[PDB]
Amino acid sequence: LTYPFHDWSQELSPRYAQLRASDAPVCPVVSEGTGDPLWLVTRYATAVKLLEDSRFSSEAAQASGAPRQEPVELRAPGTRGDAIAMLREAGLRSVLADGLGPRAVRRHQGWINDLAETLMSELASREGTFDLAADFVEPLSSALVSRTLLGELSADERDLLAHCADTGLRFCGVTHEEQVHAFTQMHEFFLEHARRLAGTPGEHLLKLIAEAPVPLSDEALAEAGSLLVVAGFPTSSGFLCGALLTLLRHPDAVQELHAHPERVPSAVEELLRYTPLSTGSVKRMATEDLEIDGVRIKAGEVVMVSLEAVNHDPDAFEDPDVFRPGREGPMHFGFGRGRHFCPGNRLARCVIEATVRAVARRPGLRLAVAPEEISWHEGLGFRRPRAIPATW
Ligand code: HEM
Numbered sequence: 001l002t003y004p005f006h007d008w009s010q011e012l013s014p015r016y017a018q019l020r021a022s023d024a025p026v027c028p029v030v031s032e033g034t035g036d037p038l039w040l041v042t043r044y045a046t047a048v049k050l051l052e053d054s055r056f057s058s059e060a061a062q063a064s065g066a067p068r069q070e071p072v073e074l075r076a077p078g079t080r081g082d083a084i085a086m087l088r089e090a091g092l093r094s095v096l097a098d099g100l101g102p103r104a105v106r107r108h109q110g111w112i113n114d115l116a117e118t119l120m121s122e123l124a125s126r127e128g129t130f131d132l133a134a135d136f137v138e139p140l141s142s143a144l145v146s147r148t149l150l151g152e153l154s155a156d157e158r159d160l161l162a163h164c165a166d167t168g169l170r171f172c173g174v175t176h177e178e179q180v181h182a183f184t185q186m187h188e189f190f191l192e193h194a195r196r197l198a199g200t201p202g203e204h205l206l207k208l209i210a211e212a213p214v215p216l217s218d219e220a221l222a223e224a225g226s227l228l229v230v231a232g233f234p235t236s237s238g239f240l241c242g243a244l245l246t247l248l249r250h251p252d253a254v255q256e257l258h259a260h261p262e263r264v265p266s267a268v269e270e271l272l273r274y275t276p277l278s279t280g281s282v283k284r285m286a287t288e289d290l291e292i293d294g295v296r297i298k299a300g301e302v303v304m305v306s307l308e309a310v311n312h313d314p315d316a317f318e319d320p321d322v323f324r325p326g327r328e329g330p331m332h333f334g335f336g337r338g339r340h341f342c343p344g345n346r347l348a349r350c351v352i353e354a355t356v357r358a359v360a361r362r363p364g365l366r367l368a369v370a371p372e373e374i375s376w377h378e379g380l381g382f383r384r385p386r387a388i389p390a391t392w
């Protein structure tokens with residue numbers, strides 16, 4: 001099987017269930033983009049074992065010469081390209097926790113919820129239809145990235161970074177050179193502007209990084225900027241788009257949340273399980289000869305986990321393809337698993353929760369077209385509809 005499976009919409013590729021039901025806990029595939037052989041995990045039980053065993057390394061799956069699912073290396077040529085380890089290396093775990101953890105959620109949750117309400121309120125004051133992607137998701141996720149991560153961006157700088165991230169993270173639809181050049185653009189942008197961005201007002205993470213004792217060079221600050229773009233922008237915008245679609249297709253569940261606001265946290269977790277995001281997989285490279293559920297993985301081979309496939313594994317979740325807030329199953333994989341559990345998870349949950357409450361407070365919000373008529377960006381690394389026509 002060639003990988004990925006080109007399931008660009010919210011419909012998960014049937015290949016995932018096909019490999020899940022097979023006997024093997026890891027199945028061989030071939031990267032469409034590079035022809036590299038890869039291993040693919042689709043079952044919850046195996047993904048836990050893989051992602052909690054640190055002998056399968058995330059860092060090694062990015063070293064020069066690594067087999068990969070992506071058409072290009074996800075870095076600007078000549079750069080280190082694993083900023084999160086570089087920042088942990090430089091001794092900034094405490095800074096990252098201040099900038100991303102519960103203390104940050106406290107600093108930002110107020111305006112995040114004000115903004116979500118304001119955006120939804122302006123849309124409700126309209127006659128007729130509007131576009132929840134352009135009119136709600138884009139301003140909310142852009143504000144999250146600017147105020148909590150990078151600093152104040154001009155609209156043109158937001159557009160450049162968002163576009164570079166989309167193009168850089170593609171599986172297809174652009175040439176390999178344009179993909180590499182997206183990373184180069186972003187890096188060259190942060191070479192010129194990261195230090196300036198770190199000085200703008202606020203308490204965004206890039207400022208905390210620049211203001212912490214280690215000082216961090218221009219190139220280190222620039223690798224921090226690119227990491228935050230690719231980890232925070234297409235993920236947040238993709239996911240908030242998908243979660244709105246999920247909510248608009250379950251008015252019964254929205255009405256329950258309207259009646260019972262205390263149930264919103266469980267709905268946030270179920271959206272993180274149910275709503276698909278990446279069109280590829282997280283990856284790890286065997287740092288030595290290892291065995292996973294009886295399958296030998298040679299040193300240097302790369303194992304992928306489809307989080308979407310795991311999140312829809314019926315061995316872990318009864319009725320996995322039903323949206324069920326309050327379900328009492330195991331932990332979802334929406335943020336991954338183990339040491340590399342998304343450190344953005346606190347701020348992401350904050351913005352997702354703000355979005356769910358803004359919707360639940362205004363029942364009657366609905367798609368203005370049929371789910372089948374929604375148009376999807378084809379070939380992105382993280383699913384995203386082109387527009388979300390909606391109305392009251
Ligand atoms: C402000 C927003 C976000 C920030 C700053 C952020 C940041 C990060 C960073 C730095 C990593 C790398 C951690 C590591 O390799 O040790 C990561 C991993 C991850 N992020 Fe996020 N993220 C954000 C939003 C999201 C969202 C909305 C999702 C999905 C709903 C998500 C899903 C993931 C997953 C699944 C991983 C694990 C990747 C792996 O195992 O290799 N992130 N995130």
Ligand SMILES: [Ca+2]
Binds near residue numbers: 065300301
């Ligand atoms: Ca090799």
